[PDB]
Paper text:
In the case of SalFlhBC the final model comprises residues 229–353 out of 219–383 in the crystallized protein, with a cleavage after Asn269. No electron density was observed for residues 219–228 and 354–383. Zn2+ was added to the crystallization solution and was necessary to obtain well diffracting crystals. In the model of SalFlhBC helix α1 is longer and has a kink at the highly conserved residue Gly236. Although the kink may arise from the crystal packing, our data show potential flexibility of the linker around this conserved glycine residue. However, these additional residues (residues 354–383) were not visible in the electron-density map, suggesting that they are unfolded. This region in SalFlhB is rich in proline residues, making it unlikely to form any stable structure. In the SalFlhBC crystal α1 primarily contacts α1 and α2 of adjacent molecules, while in the AquFlhBC crystal α1 primarily contacts α4 and the cleavage site between β1 and β2. Molecular-dynamics calculations demonstrate that the linker region is the most flexible part of FlhBC and that the deletion of the loop reduces this flexibility.
The membrane protein FlhB is a highly conserved component of the flagellar secretion system. It is composed of an N-­terminal transmembrane domain and a C-terminal cytoplasmic domain (FlhBC). Flagellar FlhBC consists of a globular domain composed of a four-stranded β-sheet surrounded by four α-helices. The globular domain is preceded by a long N-terminal α-helix (α1) that connects the cytoplasmic globular part of FlhB to the transmembrane domain.
Numbering used by the authors:
A (entry chain B): 270 to 353
B (entry chain A): 229 to 269
């Protein structure tokens, strides 16, 4: 099937790190990717960061500091997306 | 009191928190629509 999924929510105020609302593998990982696509939640394949977030980020908490830069790169990607 | 004995049952308590892991997991999945991005693969 397929291995890892992590769902993030960007902070309520625009200037704080995002939080994990959901993570899983692999049935669970699949079922998150599914609900996301169903609800038009942007989904990026970035296998190194997904395994990392999945390993280290706690659900309901702010992502860890080791992963800010990388999750900020995912955000720039979400901005690229908002233009066709 | 037998009320305490039944209340304390380790076995009833273990099923109970088995079902909680499942329940909180489901609460996790129902929050996915709140997400702004999903990181995968
Ligand atoms: Na904690
Ligand atoms: Na949002
Ligand atoms: Zn429910
Ligand atoms: Zn919730």
């Amino acid at each position: 099937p397929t291995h890892y999924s992590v769902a993030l929510q960007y902070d309520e105020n625009k200037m704080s790190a995002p939080k994990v609302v959901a993570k899983g593998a692999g049935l669970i990982a699949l079922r998150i990717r599914e609900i996301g696509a169903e609800h038009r939640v942007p989904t990026l394949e970035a296998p190194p960061l997904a395994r990392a977030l999945y390993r280290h980020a706690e659900i309901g908490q702010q992502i860890p500091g080791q992963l800010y830069a990388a999750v900020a790169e995912v955000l720039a990607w979400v901005w690229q997306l908002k233009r066709w | 009191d037998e009320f305490k004995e039944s209340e304390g049952d380790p076995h009833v308590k273990g099923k109970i928190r088995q079902m909680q892991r499942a329940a909180a997991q489901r609460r996790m999945m129902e929050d996915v629509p709140k997400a702004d991005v999903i990181v995968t693969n």
